[PDB]
Structure formats: structure tokens, C-alpha cells
Amino acid sequence: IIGGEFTTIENQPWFAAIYRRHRGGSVTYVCGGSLISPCWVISATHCFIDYPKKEDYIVYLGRSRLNSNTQGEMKFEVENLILHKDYSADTLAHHNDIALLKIRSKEGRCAQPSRTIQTIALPSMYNDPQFGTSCEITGFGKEQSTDYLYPEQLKMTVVKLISHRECQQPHYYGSEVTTKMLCAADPQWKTDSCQGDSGGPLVCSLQGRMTLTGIVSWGRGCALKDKPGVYTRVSHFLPWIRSHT
Numbered sequence: 001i002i003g004g005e006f007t008t009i010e011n012q013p014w015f016a017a018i019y020r021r022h023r024g025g026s027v028t029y030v031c032g033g034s035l036i037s038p039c040w041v042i043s044a045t046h047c048f049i050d051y052p053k054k055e056d057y058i059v060y061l062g063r064s065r066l067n068s069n070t071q072g073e074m075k076f077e078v079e080n081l082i083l084h085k086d087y088s089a090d091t092l093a094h095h096n097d098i099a100l101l102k103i104r105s106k107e108g109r110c111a112q113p114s115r116t117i118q119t120i121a122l123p124s125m126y127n128d129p130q131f132g133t134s135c136e137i138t139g140f141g142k143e144q145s146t147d148y149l150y151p152e153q154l155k156m157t158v159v160k161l162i163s164h165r166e167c168q169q170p171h172y173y174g175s176e177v178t179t180k181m182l183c184a185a186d187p188q189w190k191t192d193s194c195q196g197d198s199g200g201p202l203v204c205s206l207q208g209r210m211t212l213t214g215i216v217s218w219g220r221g222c223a224l225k226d227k228p229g230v231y232t233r234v235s236h237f238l239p240w241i242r243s244h245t
């Protein structure tokens, strides 16, 4: 997250921290995700496509820091890694950039909700907020495009939804953006998602309910003028989510 503010898991208790085991046993951070039910985390396919084996991944819930444990956290193996059959990657754009992870502990249990662990509601179909609506994004991604490290503490920020028409402009992303994607950005281009935030939540208040509106997918650079963040439009994938859960 470029700009924004540090936070803790209590302010985004559905946030899932996803890591990969190597290859000799070091564990490194991969991507964010969102807990949509006790057994199911939703994320982006591009996070897993190069290493599509479920046994390679570990999922934490209730975690506020990257490389140290948070009191009350839960650790899960991935019982099921489901990537979207119609995934494609452009140079920039990822299409159908959506993935489901079925989580199960070594004791064979799913998530127990707590103060640090809760589910996030899915939107109703084809129902998103209007352009200019402020939403929040959360993740452990880079704080500056030039950074080598990821922040050790969880971050969040606010970005405003951009209309498909505006995002379609050549000055922005041309036809790289489809109606299954949402754009969002700061009016000053001051704050944004970045590398390491992929898979995490874009959350909007809709009807007085906190709703998983988007999943962090791609962008050209980070917090660059005329280059918004691009998000998988969750309200266009409900049957896929329904069917696979």
C-alpha cells in the first residue's frame, strides 16, 4: 500500500495472509485474500499460477504483522486451490483474476470467528457503488514502488471508484480494462495498491453493509498519474463463487 496508514487485523478481520513454502523450507509472503466463509478464502489466480500446487501454501487469519506472529492468529493448510479456468494474462492485464482457497487446519478445522477473525459479505449480483464512491484497500504490499522490502505491519488506505468509461480512455488503460474489472484511485494519485497487495480486499459500504467489492489484481506501476489500481469485479463472479463453494 502506497501512502495510507498502518492498521491492525481488528480493522480488517477478514484479511488472509497467504505464504508459500519453499524448496528447502523458507516461507515467503505471496498475496492477500479475504475470508468469505469459515472454510473459504478468496484471492487472485495470478498469485498462484506459477506454483499451482496447494501443498506449497500456508494461510493465516487474524495476523497483523508479516514475519512475526499475532496473538490469536490461526494457521491453515490449503485443502483446495481453485484457479479460474478462463484466466489469461496480458502484458499488464490479468483476466478472470480470481481464486478460491479451501482452508483447513492440522486439526482439520475451518476458521473460528473471533475479535481478529470475521467473514466479509459478498455483493449482490451486478450491484456495485457509483463512481466516486470511497472504498478501502488492505495489504502487506510495498510502501514505495522502489522498495525492496514489504512493510512488517499491515496497511490500509482509501481510493475512489472510477467509471468504466474513464478507465477505458487510452490515457488510462484503453481496452486492457473490461466490465469484469473495476478501477479505483486517489484524485491526487497519492495512495494506491502495489506489489504484494494482490489478492487482497477492496471493501465498500453498500446499504450500510461492508462488502467485498473488489480483489486487488493489477496496475501499471503504483500511485502513478493516469494509472489506477485494477480490481477483479466480485459482483460479476457470483455464480463461479457459488458453484465452486
Ligand SMILES: Cn1cc(-c2nc(C(=O)NC(=N)N)c(N)nc2N)cn1
Pocket: 192, 193, 194, 195, 196, 197, 198, 216, 217, 218, 219, 220, 221, 222, 223, 224, 227, 228, 229, 230
Ligand atoms: C513493477 N510493478 C509491479 C506492479 C504491481 N502493481 C500492482 C498494483 O496493484 N498496482 C497499482 N494499483 N497501481 C499489483 N497488484 N501487483 C504488482 N505486481 C507495479 N509495478
